[PDB]
Amino acid sequence: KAGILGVGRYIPEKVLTNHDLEKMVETSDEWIRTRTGIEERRIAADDVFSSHMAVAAAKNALEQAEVAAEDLDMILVATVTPDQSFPTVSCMIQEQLGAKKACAMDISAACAGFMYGVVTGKQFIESGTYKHVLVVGVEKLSSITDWEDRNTAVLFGDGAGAAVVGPVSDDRGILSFELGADGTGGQHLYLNEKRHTIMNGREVFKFAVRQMGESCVNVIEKAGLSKEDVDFLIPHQANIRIMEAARERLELPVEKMSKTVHKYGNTSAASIPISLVEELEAGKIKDGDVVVMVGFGGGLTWGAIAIRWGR
Amino acid sequence: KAGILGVGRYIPEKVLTNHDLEKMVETSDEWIRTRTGIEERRIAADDVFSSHMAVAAAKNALEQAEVAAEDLDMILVATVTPDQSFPTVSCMIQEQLGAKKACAMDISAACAGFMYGVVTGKQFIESGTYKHVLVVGVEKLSSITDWEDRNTAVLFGDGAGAAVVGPVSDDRGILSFELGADGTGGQHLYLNEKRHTIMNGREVFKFAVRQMGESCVNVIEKAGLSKEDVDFLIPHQANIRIMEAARERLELPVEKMSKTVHKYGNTSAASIPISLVEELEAGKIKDGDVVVMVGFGGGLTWGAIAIRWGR
């Protein structure tokens, strides 16, 4: 069975508060908090790109996993904001990390990308093909944000999260997963010709609130478990109201769902690993815990994973 | 075992000859043919994007495979020129094809992308996760070509190729594969700030000529076969001189290596499936044939696959 050996993240140091946003666009601290739950988000410096954030998250994950970069068989980077289209971020961090024998590809599934990546790594490991797969979710959404548009400029932050996937001692590891997509919703969330994110917020909300909880129930069902068997939920950190719908569907207490949207905003593919690190650093997730992760993203993509934590 | 159920392609109708190039840049028909072997290449119309070419290739592959789009479990599109970063081409063609239950992600491994994709599909099928995986290699390189630069504007064409991957009756299917990358070479082939392909042609040549043949030998070795066991070689169609080096390393006759670079140029991830369709339409590849495919790409990525043809 494939499981998670270690996780790391990179959080940019610059804090962008709602009151910093109040200068830039016609918004209010009250409106942002009430509708999204965001209070702050982090913004990468002008010389810090997805590759810089990804190497930092990757180094921390490798250190936590006790895995050397030279031992990686595969590097997968989920991003829609690479430094450039080619060379990919995965190729760039393969060089900077010294991961010589590793293959490298970037994958694009928007905010569901980290889930697509972990599931992809799972397939390569359980077939016996590879042993160690590095999966990184990284976004510099600040580089594709119309900072004049109050409807989106208050939603997005920057960051990177990373996990080393590998074989774990059985009972542990990824128990089940679901990956999905619905190209019909492509009109509702797209990058326009100015490389600016355009979103139909109402439509994306309707879709997310009903799909997040359903993907969660599916992976619990596929794992042969019950809702009471879930020890922690790590949702994509886009909107506290969407996150709350998933918590209700799973009948989980407030303290069993990771909440970092208020401090980092929506970091797209980086969101789930960033939240994972937060809970692991607070000691709220322990070996043997059943953890459900779930995300939705642009293009209308989604994914969910049920994992029993530990090696 | 996972194998290839059917293949299709889309070739743009507009032909760009070397004599059309002679008006545009300071080049000559003699120089292009002598150094690359290219005589013509195809250019997609201004209203034809990667998604349009990918749906066309996908439809032809599904028809040849006798697979309905509604039965696809996964859509993988290898491209560095999507219509936009999100929604992805895979999401776009998931909608246009009516592939409702299918998940969808784009992958980025430059000219090696189709190989990364087929191997990825192989992992999902042989684990029993999925049954039918659509893999598309598509590029509109004309949209990232500096048409003022004679060093690259004579190298690239547009196109799409597609394969349906699924379980095949054993003895058949993908016997072995190799995926690789070397981020060190990222400086030699990259997209610059104008979305123009910049290349150190001499360096990329040195790398490709020695890696194409070596990847080929590796996958033959991993399949437990000999060089005499190879019935056909389908190399990435970037440069006839690079292709010839691979043919020599495998001791193969001229008529057992696919050559379409002279008519389509370098189509990056689309190159191998486009050549596959060409040989299948000429009846040169038959069930039971051992086919080796191999490619190299920007970021310095590479891949090779040995497949026994048939279902």
Swiss-Prot record, chains A, B:
Top-level EC class: transferase
Pathway: Lipid metabolism; fatty acid biosynthesis
Gene Ontology cellular component list: cytoplasm
Catalytic activity of the protein: (2S)-2-methylbutanoyl-CoA + malonyl-[ACP] + H(+) = (4S)-4-methyl-3-oxohexanoyl-[ACP] + CO2 + CoA; 2-methylpropanoyl-CoA + malonyl-[ACP] + H(+) = 4-methyl-3-oxopentanoyl-[ACP] + CO2 + CoA; 3-methylbutanoyl-CoA + malonyl-[ACP] + H(+) = 5-methyl-3-oxohexanoyl-[ACP] + CO2 + CoA; malonyl-[ACP] + acetyl-CoA + H(+) = 3-oxobutanoyl-[ACP] + CO2 + CoA
Keyword DNA damage: no
InterPro entries from the UniProt entry: ACP_syn_III_C, ACP_syn_III_N, FabH, Thiolase-like
Region ranges (ACP-binding): 237-241
Active site positions, chain numbering: 111, 236, 266
Gene Ontology molecular functions: 3-oxoacyl-[acyl-carrier-protein] synthase activity; beta-ketoacyl-acyl-carrier-protein synthase III activity; beta-ketodecanoyl-[acyl-carrier-protein] synthase activity
Major place of residence: cytoplasm
GO biological process: fatty acid biosynthetic process
Assigned EC number: 2.3.1.180, 2.3.1.300
Family annotation (CDD domains): KAS_III
Keyword tags: Acyltransferase, Cytoplasm, Fatty acid biosynthesis, Fatty acid metabolism, Lipid biosynthesis, Lipid metabolism, Multifunctional enzyme, Transferase
Superkingdom of origin: Bacteria
Subunit architecture: Homodimer.
Domain notes: The last Arg residue of the ACP-binding site is essential for the weak association between ACP/AcpP and FabH.
Protein name: Beta-ketoacyl-[acyl-carrier-protein] synthase III 1
